[PDB]
Design a protein around this ligand. Structure first.
Ligand SMILES: O=C1CCc2ccc(OCCCCN3CCN(c4ccccc4)CC3)cc2N1
Length: 554
């Protein structure tokens, strides 16, 4: 019922509707260029074959692995198809394009969308899945099903509203916003798994879940981490059916053991299937249990620290991280991992010393400068964010980071510097207790986006170094890059700074993105230009943009 035919097992577990969507997502993420209709046809053939296996597990080919089945179908349409089943899937994952040369989707008129929704609802919702999945080849697949459900509900409600556009546009805009943030967050999970391995992933998971579920026992935290790691390993490896199935299993287990996990899950666990998993994944930290003793008695002052550590290294350090993380919801996850790495380093050298107890007696003192550094960086950047506002703050990042690495492409500089500025909008509104996890964890996400974008088209050996070194040290490494001195400026191209009448039909947001694009190209043309020389240009360009259109002369 769960062994002889894998494709039948997952079809039964997930049901036909989610099965077909997850297969469509997998096909769109592997072959991002193939047209929509072709992928649908392949999905339908896979689905009709899966049904025969449900009817008879011993039917021909029903015993094949999902990768063999899915790989075979894709290869009926790029050297990957000449490879045997293990190496073949790895070749597919390697060719996923993080920024494919696809035209951005132009949202049509609201009436045009609602009429297409009512014409063929099935095709409308499949195209939505397809266009998102092929542009975000690492999107968290079960979470994409949840976005699709909200997308459908928005059209179902608003296309019946008296004012369709006033109802629909705000729901679509926040879905797009939430979808971009979810994509970047999941991309970081897959990058850490692929580049730094499962041990690094599980440590991150131990830290975050201990902060989120501080009342749970270490055995409970470890069990959840193990299952969550399998979920994301499957999803990041393209095992989307297993990933969705295991994620629903995990949500079902969490909800059946609330009493030993958290007091924050009552509401989440009354929601339907897709909403429940989403709700659980973003539930607030539980209150930490009171009267929790200090870590000193068992991790510093104890005489059996070296003995307990040597008997089980990874378990002891995992226990340390769990105990420290549950006590510090106010620390970022990268800080908590750095502190746990410090403890391990101290233990390795001190347990070999002549007097181990004296050697590691002051290990917690070494945490003080590690804690203070991100606290001051955030306190200083939030002030600058308050003096400038988001758009000016983004501009200041644009010039500084363009000078540091002028070889990075202008779209990457614009995207990344804009997202690094949004940290202030997202996090500086919190108190000091919440700023650091908000800011530092958001910085990890956006810096990872820079790393994957640069990995696509490498130009700087220094960016590669920061990206391939310690994940927890990325933000310090990027901050210390220094201005590139040997960069010879590009010859001035007037076609770059020549705006057409089409600029005034764009939204205000797009025009601000175009101004930021010209600002980067300005710095590249004159890297030693001062702030007043750049401000005089941008203020002149902005004035010319408003002028040459408020006056009707085309
Ligand atoms: O596009 C590129 C490519 C070239 C490049 C090289 C280095 C680089 O370093 C960024 C290092 C982190 C900077 N943070 C630090 C703090 N962060 C903040 C903002 C508000 C509130 C709290 C915190 C602002 C931004 C970025 C880029 N960008």
């Amino acid at each position: 019922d769960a062994h002889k035919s894998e494709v039948a097992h997952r079809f039964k577990d997930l049901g036909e509707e989610n099965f077909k969507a997850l297969v469509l997502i997998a096909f769109a993420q592997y072959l991002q260029q193939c047209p929509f209709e072709d992928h649908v046809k392949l999905v339908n053939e896979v689905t009709e074959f899966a049904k025969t296996c449900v009817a008879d597990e011993s039917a021909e080919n029903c015993d094949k692995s999902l990768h063999t089945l899915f790989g075979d179908k894709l290869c009926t349409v790029a050297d990957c198809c000449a490879k045997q089943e293990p190496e073949r899937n790895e070749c597919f994952l390697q060719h996923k394009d993080d920024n494919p040369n696809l035209p951005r989707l132009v949202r049509p008129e609201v009436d045009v969308m609602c009429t297409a929704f009512h014409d063929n609802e099935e095709t409308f919702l499949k195209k939505y899945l397809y266009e998102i999945a092929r542009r975000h080849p690492y999107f968290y697949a079960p979470e994409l099903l949840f976005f699709a459900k909200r997308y459908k509900a928005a059209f179902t409600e608003c296309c019946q509203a008296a004012d369709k556009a006033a109802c629909l546009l705000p729901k679509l805009d926040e879905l797009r916003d939430e979808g971009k943030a979810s994509s970047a967050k999941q991309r970081l999970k897959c990058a850490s798994l692929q580049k730094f391995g499962e041990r690094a992933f599980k440590a991150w998971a131990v830290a975050r879940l201990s902060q989120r579920f501080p009342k749970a026992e270490f055995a409970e935290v470890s069990k959840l981490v193990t299952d969550l790691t399998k979920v994301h390993t499957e999803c990041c490896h393209g095992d989307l059916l297993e990933c969705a199935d295991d994620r629903a299993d995990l949500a079902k287990y969490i909800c059946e053991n609330q009493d030993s996990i958290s007091s924050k899950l009552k509401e989440c666990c009354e929601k339907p299937l897709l909403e429940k998993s989403h709700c659980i994944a973003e539930v607030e930290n539980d209150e930490m249990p009171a009267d929790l003793p200090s870590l000193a008695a068992d991790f510093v002052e104890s005489k059996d620290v070296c003995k307990n550590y040597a008997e089980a290294k990874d378990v002891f350090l995992g226990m340390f991280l769990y105990e420290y993380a549950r006590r510090h919801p106010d620390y970022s996850v990268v800080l908590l991992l750095r502190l746990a790495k410090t403890y391990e380093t101290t233990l390795e050298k001190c347990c070999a010393a002549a007097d181990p107890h004296e050697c590691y007696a002051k290990v917690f003192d070494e945490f003080k400068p590690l804690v203070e550094e991100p606290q001051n960086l955030i306190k200083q950047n939030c002030e600058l964010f308050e003096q400038l506002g988001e758009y000016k703050f983004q501009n200041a990042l644009l010039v500084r980071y363009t000078k540091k690495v002028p070889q990075v492409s202008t779209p990457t500089l614009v995207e990344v510097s804009r997202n690094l500025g949004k940290v202030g909008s997202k996090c500086c509104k919190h108190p000091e207790a919440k700023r650091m996890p908000c800011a530092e964890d958001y910085l990890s996400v956006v810096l990872n986006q820079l790393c994957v974008l640069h990995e696509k088209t490498p130009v700087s050996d220094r960016v590669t170094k920061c990206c391939t070194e310690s994940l927890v040290n990325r933000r310090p490494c990027f901050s210390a890059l220094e201005v590139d001195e040997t960069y010879v400026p590009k010859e001035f191209n007037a076609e770059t700074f020549t705006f057409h009448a089409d600029i005034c039909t764009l939204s205000e947001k797009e025009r601000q993105i175009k101004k930021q694009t010209a600002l980067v190209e300005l710095v590249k043309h004159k890297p030693k230009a001062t702030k007043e020389q750049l401000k005089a240009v941008m203020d002149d360009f902005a004035a010319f943009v408003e002028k040459c259109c408020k006056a009707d002369d085309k």
